[PDB]
Amino acid sequence: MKRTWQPNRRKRAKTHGFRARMRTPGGRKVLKRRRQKGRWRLTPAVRK
Amino acid sequence: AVKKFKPYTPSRRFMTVADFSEITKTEPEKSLVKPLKKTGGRNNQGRITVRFRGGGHKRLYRIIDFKRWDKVGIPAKVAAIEYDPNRSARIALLHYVDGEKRYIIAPDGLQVGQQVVAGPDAPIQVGNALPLRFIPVGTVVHAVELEPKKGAKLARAAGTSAQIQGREGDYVILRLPSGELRKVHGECYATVGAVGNADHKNIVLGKAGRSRWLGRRPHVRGAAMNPVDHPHGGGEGRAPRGRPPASPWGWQTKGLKTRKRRKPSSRFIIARRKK
RNA sequence: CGCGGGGUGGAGCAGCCUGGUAGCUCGUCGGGCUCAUAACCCGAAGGUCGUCGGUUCAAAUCCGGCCCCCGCAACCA
RNA sequence: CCGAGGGUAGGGCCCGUGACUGGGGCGAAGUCGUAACAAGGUAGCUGUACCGGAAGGUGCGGCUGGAU
RNA sequence: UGGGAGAGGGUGGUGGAAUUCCCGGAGUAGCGGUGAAAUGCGCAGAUACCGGGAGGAACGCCGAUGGCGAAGGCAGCCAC
RNA sequence: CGAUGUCGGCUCGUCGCAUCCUGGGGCUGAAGAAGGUCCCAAGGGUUGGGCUGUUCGCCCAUUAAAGCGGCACGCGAGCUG
RNA sequence: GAAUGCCGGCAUGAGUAACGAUAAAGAGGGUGAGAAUCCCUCUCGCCGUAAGCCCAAGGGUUCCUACGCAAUGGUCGUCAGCGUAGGGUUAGGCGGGACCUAAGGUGAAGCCGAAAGGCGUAGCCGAAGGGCAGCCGGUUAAUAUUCCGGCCCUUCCCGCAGGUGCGAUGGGGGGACGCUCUAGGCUAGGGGGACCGGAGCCAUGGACGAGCCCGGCCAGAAGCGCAGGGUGGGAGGUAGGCAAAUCCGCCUCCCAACAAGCUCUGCGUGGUGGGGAAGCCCGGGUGACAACCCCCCGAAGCCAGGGAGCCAAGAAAAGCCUCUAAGCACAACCUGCGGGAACCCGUACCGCAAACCGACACAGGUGGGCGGGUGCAAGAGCACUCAGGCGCGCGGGAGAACCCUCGCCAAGGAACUCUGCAAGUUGGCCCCGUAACUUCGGGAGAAGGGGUGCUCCCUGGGGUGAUGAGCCCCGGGGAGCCGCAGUGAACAGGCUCUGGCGACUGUUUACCAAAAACACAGCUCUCUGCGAACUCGUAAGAGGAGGUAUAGGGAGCGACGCUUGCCCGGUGCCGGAAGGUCAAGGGGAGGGGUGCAAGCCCCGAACCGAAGCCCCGGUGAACGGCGGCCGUAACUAUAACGGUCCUAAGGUAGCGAAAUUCCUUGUCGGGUAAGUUCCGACCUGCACGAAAAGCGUAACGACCGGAGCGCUGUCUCGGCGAGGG
RNA sequence: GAGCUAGCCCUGGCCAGGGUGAAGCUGGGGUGAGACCCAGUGGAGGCCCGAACCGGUGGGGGAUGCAAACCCCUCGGAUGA
RNA sequence: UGGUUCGUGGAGCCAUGGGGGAAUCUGGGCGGACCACCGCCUAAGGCUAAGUACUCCGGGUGACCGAUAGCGCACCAGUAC
Ligand SMILES: [K+]
Ligand SMILES: [Mg+2]
Ligand SMILES: [Mg+2]
Ligand SMILES: [Mg+2]
Ligand SMILES: [Mg+2]
Ligand SMILES: [Mg+2]
Ligand SMILES: [Mg+2]
Ligand SMILES: [Mg+2]
Ligand SMILES: [Mg+2]
Ligand SMILES: [Mg+2]
Ligand SMILES: [Mg+2]
Ligand SMILES: [Mg+2]
Ligand SMILES: [Mg+2]
Ligand SMILES: [Mg+2]
Ligand SMILES: [Mg+2]
Ligand SMILES: [Mg+2]
Ligand SMILES: [Mg+2]
Ligand SMILES: [Mg+2]
Ligand SMILES: [Mg+2]
Ligand SMILES: [Mg+2]
Ligand SMILES: [Mg+2]
Ligand SMILES: [Mg+2]
Ligand SMILES: [Mg+2]
Ligand SMILES: [Mg+2]
Ligand SMILES: [Mg+2]
Ligand SMILES: [Mg+2]
Ligand SMILES: [Mg+2]
Ligand SMILES: [Mg+2]
Ligand SMILES: [Mg+2]
Ligand SMILES: [Mg+2]
Ligand SMILES: [Mg+2]
Ligand SMILES: [Mg+2]
Ligand SMILES: [Mg+2]
Ligand SMILES: [Mg+2]
Ligand SMILES: [Mg+2]
Ligand SMILES: [Mg+2]
Ligand SMILES: [Mg+2]
Ligand SMILES: [Mg+2]
Ligand SMILES: [Mg+2]
Ligand SMILES: [Mg+2]
Ligand SMILES: [Mg+2]
Ligand SMILES: [Mg+2]
Ligand SMILES: [Mg+2]
Ligand SMILES: [Mg+2]
Ligand SMILES: [Mg+2]
Ligand SMILES: [Mg+2]
Ligand SMILES: [Mg+2]
Ligand SMILES: [Mg+2]
Ligand SMILES: [Mg+2]
Ligand SMILES: [Mg+2]
Ligand SMILES: [Mg+2]
Ligand SMILES: [Mg+2]
Ligand SMILES: [Mg+2]
Ligand SMILES: [Mg+2]
Ligand SMILES: [Mg+2]
Ligand SMILES: [Mg+2]
Ligand SMILES: [Mg+2]
Ligand SMILES: [Mg+2]
Ligand SMILES: [Mg+2]
Ligand SMILES: [Mg+2]
Ligand SMILES: [Mg+2]
Ligand SMILES: [Mg+2]
Ligand SMILES: [Mg+2]
Ligand SMILES: [Mg+2]
Ligand SMILES: [Mg+2]
Ligand SMILES: [Mg+2]
Ligand SMILES: [Mg+2]
Ligand SMILES: [Mg+2]
Ligand SMILES: [Mg+2]
Ligand SMILES: [Mg+2]
Ligand SMILES: [Mg+2]
Ligand SMILES: [Mg+2]
Ligand SMILES: [Mg+2]
Ligand SMILES: [Mg+2]
Ligand SMILES: [Mg+2]
Ligand SMILES: [Mg+2]
Ligand SMILES: [Mg+2]
Ligand SMILES: [Mg+2]
Ligand SMILES: [Mg+2]
Ligand SMILES: [Mg+2]
Ligand SMILES: [Mg+2]
Ligand SMILES: [Mg+2]
Ligand SMILES: [Mg+2]
Ligand SMILES: [Mg+2]
Ligand SMILES: [Mg+2]
Ligand SMILES: [Mg+2]
Ligand SMILES: [Mg+2]
Ligand SMILES: [Mg+2]
Ligand SMILES: [Mg+2]
Ligand SMILES: [Mg+2]
Ligand SMILES: [Mg+2]
Ligand SMILES: [Mg+2]
Ligand SMILES: [Mg+2]
Ligand SMILES: [Mg+2]
Ligand SMILES: [Mg+2]
Ligand SMILES: [Mg+2]
Ligand SMILES: [Mg+2]
Ligand SMILES: [Mg+2]
Ligand SMILES: [Mg+2]
Ligand SMILES: [Mg+2]
Ligand SMILES: [Mg+2]
Ligand SMILES: [Mg+2]
Ligand SMILES: [Mg+2]
Ligand SMILES: [Mg+2]
Ligand SMILES: [Mg+2]
Ligand SMILES: [Mg+2]
Ligand SMILES: [Mg+2]
Ligand SMILES: [Mg+2]
Ligand SMILES: [Mg+2]
Ligand SMILES: [Mg+2]
Ligand SMILES: [Mg+2]
Ligand SMILES: [Mg+2]
Ligand SMILES: [Mg+2]
Ligand SMILES: [Mg+2]
Ligand SMILES: [Mg+2]
Ligand SMILES: [Mg+2]
Ligand SMILES: [Mg+2]
Ligand SMILES: [Mg+2]
Ligand SMILES: [Mg+2]
Ligand SMILES: [Mg+2]
Ligand SMILES: [Mg+2]
Ligand SMILES: [Mg+2]
Ligand SMILES: [Mg+2]
Ligand SMILES: [Mg+2]
Ligand SMILES: [Mg+2]
Ligand SMILES: [Mg+2]
Ligand SMILES: [Mg+2]
Ligand SMILES: [Mg+2]
Ligand SMILES: [Mg+2]
Ligand SMILES: [Mg+2]
Ligand SMILES: [Mg+2]
Ligand SMILES: [Mg+2]
Ligand SMILES: [Mg+2]
Ligand SMILES: [Mg+2]
Ligand SMILES: [Mg+2]
Ligand SMILES: [Mg+2]
Ligand SMILES: [Mg+2]
Ligand SMILES: [Mg+2]
Ligand SMILES: [Mg+2]
Ligand SMILES: [Mg+2]
Ligand SMILES: [Mg+2]
Ligand SMILES: [Mg+2]
Ligand SMILES: [Mg+2]
Ligand SMILES: [Mg+2]
Ligand SMILES: [Mg+2]
Ligand SMILES: [Mg+2]
Ligand SMILES: [Mg+2]
Ligand SMILES: [Mg+2]
Ligand SMILES: [Mg+2]
Ligand SMILES: [Mg+2]
Ligand SMILES: [Mg+2]
Ligand SMILES: [Mg+2]
Ligand SMILES: [Mg+2]
Ligand SMILES: [Mg+2]
Ligand SMILES: [Mg+2]
Ligand SMILES: [Mg+2]
Ligand SMILES: [Mg+2]
Ligand SMILES: [Mg+2]
Ligand SMILES: [Mg+2]
Ligand SMILES: [Mg+2]
Ligand SMILES: [Mg+2]
Ligand SMILES: [Mg+2]
Ligand SMILES: [Mg+2]
Ligand SMILES: [Mg+2]
Ligand SMILES: [Mg+2]
Ligand SMILES: [Mg+2]
Ligand SMILES: [Mg+2]
Ligand SMILES: [Mg+2]
Ligand SMILES: [Mg+2]
Ligand SMILES: [Mg+2]
Ligand SMILES: [Mg+2]
Ligand SMILES: [Mg+2]
Ligand SMILES: [Mg+2]
Ligand SMILES: [Mg+2]
Ligand SMILES: [Mg+2]
Ligand SMILES: [Mg+2]
Ligand SMILES: [Mg+2]
Ligand SMILES: [Mg+2]
Ligand SMILES: [Mg+2]
Ligand SMILES: [Mg+2]
Ligand SMILES: [Mg+2]
Ligand SMILES: [Mg+2]
Ligand SMILES: [Mg+2]
Ligand SMILES: [Mg+2]
Ligand SMILES: [Mg+2]
Ligand SMILES: [Mg+2]
Ligand SMILES: [Mg+2]
Ligand SMILES: [Mg+2]
Ligand SMILES: [Mg+2]
Ligand SMILES: [Mg+2]
Ligand SMILES: [Mg+2]
Ligand SMILES: [Mg+2]
Ligand SMILES: [Mg+2]
Ligand SMILES: [Mg+2]
Ligand SMILES: [Mg+2]
Ligand SMILES: [Mg+2]
Ligand SMILES: [Mg+2]
Ligand SMILES: [Mg+2]
Ligand SMILES: [Mg+2]
Ligand SMILES: [Mg+2]
Ligand SMILES: [Mg+2]
Ligand SMILES: [Mg+2]
Ligand SMILES: [Mg+2]
Ligand SMILES: [Mg+2]
Ligand SMILES: [Mg+2]
Ligand SMILES: [Mg+2]
Ligand SMILES: [Mg+2]
Ligand SMILES: [Mg+2]
Ligand SMILES: [Mg+2]
Ligand SMILES: [Mg+2]
Ligand SMILES: [Mg+2]
Ligand SMILES: [Mg+2]
Ligand SMILES: [Mg+2]
Ligand SMILES: [Mg+2]
Ligand SMILES: [Mg+2]
Ligand SMILES: [Mg+2]
Ligand SMILES: [Mg+2]
Ligand SMILES: [Mg+2]
Ligand SMILES: [Mg+2]
Ligand SMILES: [Mg+2]
Ligand SMILES: [Mg+2]
Ligand SMILES: [Mg+2]
Ligand SMILES: [Mg+2]
Ligand SMILES: [Mg+2]
Ligand SMILES: [Mg+2]
Ligand SMILES: [Mg+2]
Ligand SMILES: [Mg+2]
Ligand SMILES: [Mg+2]
Ligand SMILES: [Mg+2]
Ligand SMILES: [Mg+2]
Ligand SMILES: [Mg+2]
Ligand SMILES: [Mg+2]
Ligand SMILES: [Mg+2]
Ligand SMILES: [Mg+2]
Ligand SMILES: [Mg+2]
Ligand SMILES: [Mg+2]
Ligand SMILES: [Mg+2]
Ligand SMILES: [Mg+2]
Ligand SMILES: [Mg+2]
Ligand SMILES: [Mg+2]
Ligand SMILES: [Mg+2]
Ligand SMILES: [Mg+2]
Ligand SMILES: [Mg+2]
Ligand SMILES: [Mg+2]
Ligand SMILES: [Mg+2]
Ligand SMILES: [Mg+2]
Ligand SMILES: [Mg+2]
Ligand SMILES: [Mg+2]
Ligand SMILES: [Mg+2]
Ligand SMILES: [Mg+2]
Ligand SMILES: [Mg+2]
Ligand SMILES: [Mg+2]
Ligand SMILES: [Mg+2]
Ligand SMILES: [Mg+2]
Ligand SMILES: [Mg+2]
Ligand SMILES: [Mg+2]
Ligand SMILES: [Mg+2]
Ligand SMILES: [Mg+2]
Ligand SMILES: [Mg+2]
Ligand SMILES: [Mg+2]
Ligand SMILES: [Mg+2]
Ligand SMILES: [Mg+2]
Ligand SMILES: [Mg+2]
Ligand SMILES: [Mg+2]
């Protein structure tokens, strides 16, 4: 049957992307936390 | 003269449709249309705020002249009567001798080829617009400004009309289409005659899909829902109301008046409505 | 021996709660008016209060037991 | 090939009969009231309408086959 | 051909009397109703009187024992 | 109750005897035939249908007879639902 | 030593289940240490509206080549989407950007919010919509509308020539529109040829033939040809299109009019450039100077912005054209020609799947285009086949029980069972024929029946063409032939009668319920006079609605028919300027503390004092409710009638053992051999009843009940056979 | 977090083939004129049969599955909510 | 209304959303309702080291751990998944 993951590059970048995160107070905390934790990637990979 | 159909589908049994007999032109003026943004009953939050809206046929809004005192004294000619899907009345196209073109609500019995005009000196004649204080007592008028220069507010749907009852100072006494008696300022404009297409109320929609064409989605009874949804929700089997009949939001819906108590127009309502 | 209500002139109901008193409508009996009957008018009689036992100076009335009659309930499985 | 008739299937008319049900006629002395006949004690009749244990009553319009 | 009388019929318009309701004034202890009553209504101000307003229906006197129509039926007044 | 799946049916049996039939008897208000009642006996047998989820029961047609109970109201790691 | 403890290791079940669609395999020859499994050849089978081809999304080297087989691959492995290395994606015209705008997003102005932030006109962003210039062939191991060849075209800059009041983010035109049905003429595609080209073939009884087999085109600028779309010209006035306008809109005048003219597309033709089969012998080469022609069928595509009808009334903006303003008329724009200039990103490969989403090389899921032929009435259905692609990554045997999927069955024919569950039957098309009832449409494919192949002969109308022949499409009659059987295989209703419920088509518990449930047109009540009510929001602001009582919100009821009774005492709502009660506040009778005192400070009665409540009325398609005991008639029985108690009033019509009835399998009737179900009645209705509507209702239903006919392995009662295990 | 699912908004796309044959229109009949009837034409519809497509009715299989909802037969809608 | 130990308490003090609304030392606030007496202090402007907190960083030391311990990571770890 049709499952839950149906990838879509524009969707991905526009929902979880760097510019979406920077626009909003909670998004900047996501970025702040993932830097303090030392994540190699602050935001999902999508090829644009 | 609403039109019936033979019973060759279950729905054709009862469906009735307007005769469209007065319409003389079947596409609108390219210069007087604009796109009508369907809302689905959602506001700028994206939230539904008027339930059960959406899915209607695409429409173009026709710009309608509800002022008409824009052009005191300039006579116009009735070039066409047209179908307008944004209202129940028909609409009329006016070619002013100006060359300017406008749409107006089509009063009852207005004829293609005749002329209308706006102003204090205008004849008392079907289609003309005058400040209320110059229209003789007893006259049947439509498209009535509620306040001077603010725009024609009252008696605009198919077949409605207001009747001029008397004068009192700067104000005129009107009997609205609801039967209420009200003071309306004398300089407010009005148009002689009743709104046309009076048979509009005798159309029989005949099937559910027809309501879907109009943008009306199906309405769910409170008694059909669950307690988390509605005051009438729940119950084993069917259930009577079991409380004063209420809206989804809890307020009483059989008799409970809701006009605001201290509203300033109260000094202007003479008698409440009828029937 | 699940929980309620009732039993009082001939019928249908008060009085019981708050102990001392039996009442109301109809019906029945006698006499009027009527040619006569009903209606109407004047008078009259009939009830020891389902029963037994206790309390009391005194029980339709308060408390126990027995009879007779109506009503409600009987769920989770 | 036609063909008596037999078989299958589906209709039309008539008769008899059926739990139960609707009124109808009739029947020496049943129960309830008293609608009509006199101005019958609300003049009656009437077409229709609504209502009521029953006759009836009432509305609307009509008739004199009504009286003083 | 020229004349007449008529509530003959259909459409539009339109006049006054009267009842009801509404508003304003004025005014107070009852009004209404019946064979007699009670219900009802009235000091939260009724009835009775005046001014204004709204609305529907029916056309007094003329009018008659009258007139018209095939019958049912037809009555303020104006015009078609 | 850190689970002993619970009615009826179907399938498959097995057992008890307080015996429905078949076998052997006594008594009889046992003439015969046919019954009634009690005793011995569990080897074998104990049908097909209509109704109801039904167990049970009533009915139809038969029959030598259409027995009554136990096996976790026998049997859901065998089926049904 | 225990915590169904935690982490790790290793046992048991066990050489057990399983190795993933039952589309299917066999042999020869290669290679290699090793071969059912890799490569090649012949045979066989499977898909073919796909299981073939082209796009898009997603994936991200998986593509090509060489060398490899530890692990990955459900077995094997020499093979591979695996490991190592090298190689591979080429654009002014394709797609996106340097263009347009849609929802929406954002947002100078502005508005709002303790903060964070929320709004918001224009404007900006935003596409699979608008707009816009490239077609055919060749070449690589691997890219190609990109490289190459042939022939075309677009914009930008600059120069020359001719022309013109040139000039814009501004004004206008246009762009620019739905659904169903559809004309003319074409193209795609397809069928046939006794004509044209071709390597060959003659078999096993016949055939050297008007035999077999194969192939008979594609792209193209200007020009012309056919078919279409778009489109009035001139003049005078002019107050309107937020300045101006010679433009547009309005009025009048003359001419033009189913046309023509000008314009713009499509198709055909076209200089020219390409392609080219079988067979054959090593993707190649030959064929081959390949030929390339005629007839038919024919789109849903093209001409297109075509036509008609209908109601539910069918984006925007730019490019483009026209108008003028500032300005500039050495300029600038238009037209024709010439030279130059022309950037960024994608391009490999998979793509109904072993490379995408499902932990797997997973029988599931995934949007657009092409989708050939024959027969079957048609078709994208069904059967077989073209091109192309496969045989599904464990095999070999055996021929038990039992299981799955499938075939048949003597006599019986629902006896099975909760239930005909299941499986049979029926099954397309042509004709004949068809009932109650009905809202006159329907019920209807009612039911039930007959026909259906092939051959010869005669004949009717149509399409193309030319009216003829040919091709092709509908048919009509007569005479015969064969079989058990002619929609001979495949695809393709079993039917009737009668109840309950719901009018109906629809909708639902993704993944145990599809229904009688929700919805529905329609009916009623009620709120709402517009800055509406109502809804979301602290707000600003939105929705409602660019709507205005024939409108919008809320509620119940549920097509339609005939109807919807009595109770307003309680609760609700609605009306009531009296009266009663009532808060803060006003008022301050009279008290109290402190000071020597002026004064400061505290308490406080009466009285004035809203909504709400009380009280007075109204109101049921508002919440709701609609009696008990006893007596009575000239057989009995039963009570039309009466008596009395209680209520706010004591259930009317209609219906009733019901989707409701406990006693209950009520009683009687029908159907059956027999009927706790069914149907029709009755009425002591435990505990129907009139918009939580009452009683009916034609049509409808994968709803639930009862009966009959047809037919059956459901069953008496089982047997045999097939394949996967 | 609305790349699943639910509703709405903007813009696109898709629905083989066959069947039934409403209104209107034309002609004819009819009448004072009408209503209306007949024939032809016409192509309406939450119309009918049936693929794609969307569903998920009954049964069987599956049940450490091919699959954490699948498979086979059967069945509903298929110009419209 | 908040703050303080103070939860309405005899409830002052400090702060302040609403209403009313002075004075310039003979002016004003405080000493826990209020008055008197006696005292303390000068609101409605601003700034001001040090002593105090912490440990991303560097070093010093452990009756701290010693690869299931010690940080989640002794190791190419905020990685693989
Ligand atoms: K329970
Ligand atoms: Mg899904
Ligand atoms: Mg998606
Ligand atoms: Mg994307
Ligand atoms: Mg995308
Ligand atoms: Mg997206
Ligand atoms: Mg977002
Ligand atoms: Mg982003
Ligand atoms: Mg910040
Ligand atoms: Mg890094
Ligand atoms: Mg992130
Ligand atoms: Mg109709
Ligand atoms: Mg009809
Ligand atoms: Mg009209
Ligand atoms: Mg437009
Ligand atoms: Mg426009
Ligand atoms: Mg809007
Ligand atoms: Mg918004
Ligand atoms: Mg949000
Ligand atoms: Mg709403
Ligand atoms: Mg809505
Ligand atoms: Mg409207
Ligand atoms: Mg209109
Ligand atoms: Mg006004
Ligand atoms: Mg309506
Ligand atoms: Mg609409
Ligand atoms: Mg509605
Ligand atoms: Mg509803
Ligand atoms: Mg409910
Ligand atoms: Mg519910
Ligand atoms: Mg919720
Ligand atoms: Mg709640
Ligand atoms: Mg609630
Ligand atoms: Mg409720
Ligand atoms: Mg409920
Ligand atoms: Mg209930
Ligand atoms: Mg419910
Ligand atoms: Mg109710
Ligand atoms: Mg209730
Ligand atoms: Mg309520
Ligand atoms: Mg409210
Ligand atoms: Mg009003
Ligand atoms: Mg008492
Ligand atoms: Mg006493
Ligand atoms: Mg007495
Ligand atoms: Mg005598
Ligand atoms: Mg007497
Ligand atoms: Mg014979
Ligand atoms: Mg007697
Ligand atoms: Mg009488
Ligand atoms: Mg009499
Ligand atoms: Mg009389
Ligand atoms: Mg009398
Ligand atoms: Mg009466
Ligand atoms: Mg009185
Ligand atoms: Mg009084
Ligand atoms: Mg007074
Ligand atoms: Mg009135
Ligand atoms: Mg237990
Ligand atoms: Mg355990
Ligand atoms: Mg267990
Ligand atoms: Mg069985
Ligand atoms: Mg014996
Ligand atoms: Mg004997
Ligand atoms: Mg004997
Ligand atoms: Mg014995
Ligand atoms: Mg035995
Ligand atoms: Mg035995
Ligand atoms: Mg039984
Ligand atoms: Mg039992
Ligand atoms: Mg029983
Ligand atoms: Mg015997
Ligand atoms: Mg037993
Ligand atoms: Mg037991
Ligand atoms: Mg038991
Ligand atoms: Mg068992
Ligand atoms: Mg089981
Ligand atoms: Mg069982
Ligand atoms: Mg077990
Ligand atoms: Mg077992
Ligand atoms: Mg067990
Ligand atoms: Mg069950
Ligand atoms: Mg221990
Ligand atoms: Mg464990
Ligand atoms: Mg543990
Ligand atoms: Mg342990
Ligand atoms: Mg563990
Ligand atoms: Mg380890
Ligand atoms: Mg372990
Ligand atoms: Mg191990
Ligand atoms: Mg092991
Ligand atoms: Mg082992
Ligand atoms: Mg073994
Ligand atoms: Mg074993
Ligand atoms: Mg296994
Ligand atoms: Mg497996
Ligand atoms: Mg298969
Ligand atoms: Mg198979
Ligand atoms: Mg196959
Ligand atoms: Mg072989
Ligand atoms: Mg082989
Ligand atoms: Mg091998
Ligand atoms: Mg090998
Ligand atoms: Mg193999
Ligand atoms: Mg090979
Ligand atoms: Mg061979
Ligand atoms: Mg094919
Ligand atoms: Mg991947
Ligand atoms: Mg290997
Ligand atoms: Mg290996
Ligand atoms: Mg190696
Ligand atoms: Mg492996
Ligand atoms: Mg595998
Ligand atoms: Mg090798
Ligand atoms: Mg090797
Ligand atoms: Mg490559
Ligand atoms: Mg190029
Ligand atoms: Mg550039
Ligand atoms: Mg833009
Ligand atoms: Mg912030
Ligand atoms: Mg954007
Ligand atoms: Mg853009
Ligand atoms: Mg685009
Ligand atoms: Mg568009
Ligand atoms: Mg392009
Ligand atoms: Mg080209
Ligand atoms: Mg090469
Ligand atoms: Mg110019
Ligand atoms: Mg347009
Ligand atoms: Mg439409
Ligand atoms: Mg054509
Ligand atoms: Mg072509
Ligand atoms: Mg063809
Ligand atoms: Mg001008
Ligand atoms: Mg060649
Ligand atoms: Mg050559
Ligand atoms: Mg198409
Ligand atoms: Mg087109
Ligand atoms: Mg068109
Ligand atoms: Mg726009
Ligand atoms: Mg100048
Ligand atoms: Mg110059
Ligand atoms: Mg020019
Ligand atoms: Mg650039
Ligand atoms: Mg690039
Ligand atoms: Mg490429
Ligand atoms: Mg698929
Ligand atoms: Mg692949
Ligand atoms: Mg595989
Ligand atoms: Mg994979
Ligand atoms: Mg797969
Ligand atoms: Mg071909
Ligand atoms: Mg066919
Ligand atoms: Mg295979
Ligand atoms: Mg396959
Ligand atoms: Mg396999
Ligand atoms: Mg094997
Ligand atoms: Mg074997
Ligand atoms: Mg055979
Ligand atoms: Mg058989
Ligand atoms: Mg049979
Ligand atoms: Mg048979
Ligand atoms: Mg049966
Ligand atoms: Mg049985
Ligand atoms: Mg069943
Ligand atoms: Mg069959
Ligand atoms: Mg068949
Ligand atoms: Mg019949
Ligand atoms: Mg019939
Ligand atoms: Mg029938
Ligand atoms: Mg019927
Ligand atoms: Mg009919
Ligand atoms: Mg048939
Ligand atoms: Mg037929
Ligand atoms: Mg024949
Ligand atoms: Mg043959
Ligand atoms: Mg069929
Ligand atoms: Mg339904
Ligand atoms: Mg339903
Ligand atoms: Mg119903
Ligand atoms: Mg109905
Ligand atoms: Mg449908
Ligand atoms: Mg479900
Ligand atoms: Mg569920
Ligand atoms: Mg679930
Ligand atoms: Mg299911
Ligand atoms: Mg359900
Ligand atoms: Mg269904
Ligand atoms: Mg539902
Ligand atoms: Mg509903
Ligand atoms: Mg319905
Ligand atoms: Mg209404
Ligand atoms: Mg709110
Ligand atoms: Mg706030
Ligand atoms: Mg708006
Ligand atoms: Mg209805
Ligand atoms: Mg309905
Ligand atoms: Mg309902
Ligand atoms: Mg009827
Ligand atoms: Mg009634
Ligand atoms: Mg009441
Ligand atoms: Mg009341
Ligand atoms: Mg009340
Ligand atoms: Mg008050
Ligand atoms: Mg109640
Ligand atoms: Mg009550
Ligand atoms: Mg009954
Ligand atoms: Mg019964
Ligand atoms: Mg019933
Ligand atoms: Mg009941
Ligand atoms: Mg019963
Ligand atoms: Mg029962
Ligand atoms: Mg019985
Ligand atoms: Mg019987
Ligand atoms: Mg029955
Ligand atoms: Mg009875
Ligand atoms: Mg109910
Ligand atoms: Mg029905
Ligand atoms: Mg029916
Ligand atoms: Mg249905
Ligand atoms: Mg259904
Ligand atoms: Mg049945
Ligand atoms: Mg049957
Ligand atoms: Mg049968
Ligand atoms: Mg069998
Ligand atoms: Mg086998
Ligand atoms: Mg999306
Ligand atoms: Mg989604
Ligand atoms: Mg569209
Ligand atoms: Mg379709
Ligand atoms: Mg047909
Ligand atoms: Mg026809
Ligand atoms: Mg037409
Ligand atoms: Mg349909
Ligand atoms: Mg059909
Ligand atoms: Mg299924
Ligand atoms: Mg599905
Ligand atoms: Mg089945
Ligand atoms: Mg499962
Ligand atoms: Mg399946
Ligand atoms: Mg199937
Ligand atoms: Mg279709
Ligand atoms: Mg269908
Ligand atoms: Mg639609
Ligand atoms: Mg504190
Ligand atoms: Mg505090
Ligand atoms: Mg304090
Ligand atoms: Mg303050
Ligand atoms: Mg001082
Ligand atoms: Mg001072
Ligand atoms: Mg202070
Ligand atoms: Mg102090
Ligand atoms: Mg002190
Ligand atoms: Mg101090
Ligand atoms: Mg410091
Ligand atoms: Mg140590
Ligand atoms: Mg370690
Ligand atoms: Mg560690
Ligand atoms: Mg350690
Ligand atoms: Mg660290
Ligand atoms: Mg570290
Ligand atoms: Mg660790
Ligand atoms: Mg570690
Ligand atoms: Mg790592």
UniProtKB/Swiss-Prot annotation, chain A:
Q: Name one GO molecular function term.
A: structural constituent of ribosome
Which keywords fit this entry according to its UniProt record? Answer: Ribonucleoprotein, Ribosomal protein
PANTHER family hit by this protein = LARGE RIBOSOMAL SUBUNIT PROTEIN BL34M (PTHR14503:SF4), MITOCHONDRIAL RIBOSOMAL PROTEIN 34 FAMILY MEMBER (PTHR14503)
Family to which the UniProt record says this protein belongs: Belongs to the bacterial ribosomal protein bL34 family.
Misc note? The open reading frame (ORF) for this protein is entirely within the ORF for the RNase P protein (RnaP). The two start codons are separated by four nucleotides.
Q: Which Pfam families match?
A: Ribosomal_L34
- One GO CC term of this entry? ribonucleoprotein complex
Annotated function = Found on the solvent side of the large subunit.
Per the record, the domain of life is Bacteria
Q: Which HAMAP family match?
A: Ribosomal_bL34
Q: Which GO terms describe its biological process?
A: translation
Q: Where is the composition biased (Basic residues)?
A: 29-48
Q: Which gene encodes it?
A: rpmH
What organism, scientifically named, is this protein from? Answer: Thermus thermophilus (strain ATCC 27634 / DSM 579 / HB8)
Region span, Disordered: 26-48
The protein depicted here goes by the name Large ribosomal subunit protein bL34
- Write down the InterPro entries for this protein, in alphabetical order: Ribosomal_bL34, Ribosomal_bL34_CS
Q: How does it assemble?
A: Part of the 50S ribosomal subunit.
Swiss-Prot record, chain B:
| Domain of life according to the entry | Bacteria
* Sequence similarity: Belongs to the universal ribosomal protein uL2 family.
The UniProt entry's GO CC annotations, sorted and at most eight, read: large ribosomal subunit
Query: Which gene carries the instructions for this protein?
Result: rplB
Q: Which UniProt keywords apply?
A: Ribonucleoprotein, Ribosomal protein, RNA-binding, rRNA-binding
Presence of keyword RNA-binding: yes
Instruction: Name any one GO molecular function.
Output: structural constituent of ribosome
**Function noted in UniProt:** One of the primary rRNA binding proteins. Required for association of the 30S and 50S subunits to form the 70S ribosome, for tRNA binding and peptide bond formation. It has been suggested to have peptidyltransferase activity; this is somewhat controversial. Makes several contacts with the 16S rRNA (forming bridge B7b) in the 70S ribosome.
Q: Pfam families per the record?
A: Ribosomal_L2, Ribosomal_L2_C
Which residue stretches does the UniProt record annotate as biased composition, category Basic residues? 256-275
Question: Which parts of this chain are annotated as the region Disordered?
Answer: 222-275
Q: Basic and acidic residues bias located where?
A: 229-239
Which biological process, per GO, is one annotated for this protein?
cytoplasmic translation
Ion transport in keyword set: no
Q: Which SMART domains match?
A: Ribosomal_L2, Ribosomal_L2_C
The membrane spanning regions, by residue number, are: none
Describe the subunit structure.
Part of the 50S ribosomal subunit. Forms a bridge to the 30S subunit in the 70S ribosome, contacting the 16S rRNA. May also make transient contacts with protein S6 during translation in the 70S ribosome.
Question: What's the protein here called?
Answer: Large ribosomal subunit protein uL2
